[PDB]
């Protein structure tokens, strides 16, 4: 029973060349280059799920810091001021109140100063 | 000598961008109404309205 492998090799090549479209040059059209640029573009998509969580945390902090200096503190004395009491509001929903709901942010900052910390 | 890497579709098409054509020195003869080249004998044999050949 001779088997010829010319029809199930083709389905696996088109499955590679579909994930690898939108790429420059010969990375999107010939197979011995487009296999390297699918494995490499899958390692980057694995590392950058961790680095996504580090690039917003470093963005939330630098917006609380700018907003809390305009009222009369720093960032580091504000976090010690909120944790003298227990206000328990994270960085994602303080950097929302820093931009949009600016009057409610000032009513938080005055209570950290009243916390004397 | 030889190259070390091949040239892509971009760096091959950029070379041949300085390569176009032109021959627009055309002129209409006043008498016969025949088109020819500027400062040349018309293909019937008239130059500035005079048969020469």
């Amino acid at each position: 029973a001779r088997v010829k492998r010319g029809v199930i090799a083709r389905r696996r090549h088109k499955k590679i060349l579909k994930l690898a479209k939108g790429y420059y040059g010969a990375r999107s059209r010939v197979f011995r280059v487009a296999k390297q640029a699918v494995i490499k573009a899958g390692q980057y998509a694995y590392r950058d799920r961790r680095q996504r969580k580090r690039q917003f945390r470093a963005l939330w902090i630098a917006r609380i810091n700018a907003g809390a200096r305009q009222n009369g503190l720093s960032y580091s004395r504000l976090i010690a001021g909120l944790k003298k009491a227990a206000i328990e509001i994270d960085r994602k929903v303080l950097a929302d109140l820093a931009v949009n709901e600016k009057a409610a942010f000032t009513a938080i900052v005055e209570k950290a100063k009243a916390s004397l910390a | 000598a030889v190259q070390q890497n091949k040239k892509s579709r971009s760096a091959r098409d950029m070379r041949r961008s300085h390569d176009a054509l032109e021959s627009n020195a055309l002129s209409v003869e006043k008498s016969t109404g025949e088109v020819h080249l500027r400062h040349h004998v018309s293909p019937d044999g008239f130059y500035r309205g005079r048969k020469v050949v």
Partner: protein, 102 residues
């Protein structure tokens, strides 16, 4: 009218009429959900925050649907060492809808 409710180990910026995607919780479709874990309640300008939590305030929600979103890929490759391993993932979620900020 905006609250800060804490659903799945993380909190949200919930308004009066929001659709909102929450991690999967154990309740059927159509039933109503209350939230007793609100952290600041504002209204017009009248804003109050919790001492650790705000007393008395509730947020009523109900489940629209369920589902799984956006299949992602995982490639664990090592150069030059004869090792490569793949896996797929689709995380569950639960879409709810907010009615009233009590």
């Amino acid at each position: 009218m905006y609250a800060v409710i804490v659903t799945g180990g993380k909190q949200h910026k919930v308004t009066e009429g929001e659709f909102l995607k929450v991690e999967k919780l154990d309740v059927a479709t159509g039933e109503a959900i209350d939230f007793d874990r609100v952290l600041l309640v504002a209204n017009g300008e009248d804003v109050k925050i919790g001492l650790p939590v705000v007393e008395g305030a509730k947020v009523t929600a109900e489940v629209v649907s369920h589902g799984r979103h956006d299949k992602v890929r995982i490639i664990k490759f090592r150069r030059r060492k004869h090792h490569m391993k793949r896996q797929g993932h689709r995380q569950w979620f639960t879409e709810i809808k907010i009615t009233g900020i009590q």
